[PDB]
Amino acid sequence: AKDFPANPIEKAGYKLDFSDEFNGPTLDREKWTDYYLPHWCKDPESAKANYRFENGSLVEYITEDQKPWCPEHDGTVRSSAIMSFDKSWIHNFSGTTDNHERNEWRGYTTKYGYFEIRAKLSNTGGGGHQAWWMVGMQDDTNDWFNSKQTGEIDILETFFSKKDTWRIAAYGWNDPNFQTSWTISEDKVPSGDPTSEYHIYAMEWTPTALKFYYDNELFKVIYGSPDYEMGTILNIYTDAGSGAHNDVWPKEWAIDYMRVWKPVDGYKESLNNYLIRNRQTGKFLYIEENNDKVSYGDITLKNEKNAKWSKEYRDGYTLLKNNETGEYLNIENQTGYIEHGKVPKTWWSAQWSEVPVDGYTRFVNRWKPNMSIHTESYEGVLQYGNVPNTYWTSQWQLIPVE
């Protein structure tokens, strides 16, 4: 009774583009191959997955006597994987020149959409992890070293030893235009027990961003996204960077389904304006003439124009711009209050991390990463300070408006 209920197959405003309901008892070979990156391995039979279907789920598993998947490149790492493609040169994590030629096959490769699995994670504990991830298909050159279409998104990479987390990561590899340094988090999930229950994990990948959802609620945002087709890998590991195996076998997890939907009206390629409302007070942010602070209050016809905001992005951080004044919110002079001015976009004091919480948004400064935007003194003006994530005076709603 503690599983999160499966979502419906039909999603309002979307069309289903791909699904595997994983009922078994055989893997659908029109969608998946059961070898892990076999082009890296002189003998690809080592890279074959072990798996079964149980209770409507794919159960990938590693046995105690399973051999390493590709000892000449990855040492004694063990993994059982399926992939939605089979293609030369893909995901050269070792930077080897030793590719083994494959006849290109694409079970499912796509650019953009709403991607979702429902899964119950390994309960073995000890070293190891499971992963749902996507890699660029390198369609530009069909090699590695000259490709710039090599992005990696680890939608789920949760470690067996960290039972209350959801690990999410991304890196562009050879791509100069996506996530050129690793970003990795493993925040605690807001509810539930991922290793004893089914939960829903999803990513919406648009031209603008990657947005990650846990049981249908926003959990993480990465601004910036790959702009080419990507393939999917679902796998489980032990004896890898996530740690040496403990003595509980097999290492296994269960995936109920994978679904991908496409928006009926497509995605925006990039003009949005926002009102910004405080969770605790219900008041809106605006800039008053001849006031060096940022005000909050009820929406009125008098302040409406001054209550509209734009977002801009730099280094993956958010800048907040008042539409009427053209000024950025910043903390350069460290006064305890949010300032507004036409300051350089390169100032870290004007750049903010967006942190989803409980259906709302916190803004955390880049220059001073302990400082969030809040109104905990309720002084009629906007503050920054170190206050807990659970304080509603630090939680904000960005509301799109004309």
Would you state the structure tokens that stand for residue 398, as one six-digit string? 């960005």
Angle at 147 between CA 143 and CA 152, to 5 degrees: 100
The stretch near Ca ion (CB under 5 A) out of 37-45, 49-57, 106-114, 222-230 is 49-57
Distance of closest approach, residue 53 Cβ to Ca ion, in angstroms: 9
- Of the pair 229, 256, the CB lying nearest Ca ion is at 256
Q: Is there binding between residue 22 and Ca ion (CB under 5 A)?
A: yes
3-class SS at 172? Answer: coil
Would you state the structure tokens that stand for residue 133, as one six-digit string? 């991830």
- Of the pair 56, 125, the CB lying nearest Ca ion is at 56
Distance of closest approach, residue 26 Cβ to Ca ion, in angstroms: 14
Tell whether residue 45 is among the known ligand binding residues: no
- Of the pair 56, 126, the CB lying nearest Ca ion is at 56
Cα distance between residue 402 and residue 326, in whole Å: 17
**Residue 18 near residue 111, CB atoms below 8 Å:** no
Determine the number of helices (DSSP H) and then strands (DSSP E) in the chain: 1, 28
- Of the pair 24, 243, the CB lying nearest Ca ion is at 24
Instruction: Please name which of 303, 400, 305 lies closest in space to residue 361, comparing C-alpha atoms.
Output: 400
Distance of closest approach, residue 20 Cβ to Ca ion, in angstroms: 8
Cα distance between residue 157 and residue 140, in whole Å: 27
Q: Which residue is nearest to Ca ion (CB)?
A: 56
Distance of closest approach, residue 86 Cβ to Ca ion, in angstroms: 24
Tell whether residue 256 is among the known ligand binding residues: yes
Q: Is there binding between residue 116 and Ca ion (CB under 5 A)?
A: no
Instruction: Please name which of 384, 388, 389, 331 lies closest in space to residue 355, comparing C-alpha atoms.
Output: 389
- Of the pair 10, 45, the CB lying nearest Ca ion is at 10
Cα distance between residue 200 and residue 214, in whole Å: 6
Residue 96: CB atoms within 10 Å: 12
- Of the pair 60, 175, the CB lying nearest Ca ion is at 60
Candidate list 4, 7, 17, 21; residue touching Ca ion; CB under 5 A: 21
What are the distances in angstroms from CA 323 to CA 76, 320, 382, 384? 56, 9, 17, 21
- Of the pair 114, 257, the CB lying nearest Ca ion is at 257
Q: Is there binding between residue 261 and Ca ion (CB under 5 A)?
A: no
**Residue 153 near residue 230, CB atoms below 8 Å:** yes
Distance of closest approach, residue 118 Cβ to Ca ion, in angstroms: 8
Would you state the structure tokens that stand for residue 117, as one six-digit string? 């699995």
The stretch near Ca ion (CB under 5 A) out of 56-64, 236-244, 261-269, 295-303 is 56-64
Residue with tokens 């069309």: 15
Tell whether residue 56 is among the known ligand binding residues: yes
Candidate list 7, 19, 54, 56; residue touching Ca ion; CB under 5 A: 56
Please count the residues of this chain forming the interface with Ca ion, following the rule CB under 5 A.
5
Q: Is there binding between residue 263 and Ca ion (CB under 5 A)?
A: no
Q: Is there binding between residue 54 and Ca ion (CB under 5 A)?
A: no
Q: Is there binding between residue 256 and Ca ion (CB under 5 A)?
A: yes
- Of the pair 17, 21, the CB lying nearest Ca ion is at 21
Distance of closest approach, residue 60 Cβ to Ca ion, in angstroms: 14
Instruction: Please name which of 89, 91, 93, 62 lies closest in space to residue 75, comparing C-alpha atoms.
Output: 93
- Of the pair 57, 150, the CB lying nearest Ca ion is at 57
Instruction: Please name which of 239, 234, 233 lies closest in space to residue 78, comparing C-alpha atoms.
Output: 239
Instruction: Please name which of 66, 97, 95 lies closest in space to residue 79, comparing C-alpha atoms.
Output: 66
Cα distance between residue 92 and residue 106, in whole Å: 18
Distance of closest approach, residue 23 Cβ to Ca ion, in angstroms: 5
Distance of closest approach, residue 135 Cβ to Ca ion, in angstroms: 25
**Residue 234 near residue 49, CB atoms below 8 Å:** no
Distance of closest approach, residue 16 Cβ to Ca ion, in angstroms: 15
Q: Is there binding between residue 24 and Ca ion (CB under 5 A)?
A: no
Cα distance between residue 252 and residue 119, in whole Å: 11
Q: Which residues are annotated binding-site positions?
A: 21, 56, 256
**Residue ranges binding Ca ion (CB under 5 A):** 21-22, 56, 256-257
Q: Residues annotated as binding site for Ca(2+)?
A: 21, 56, 256
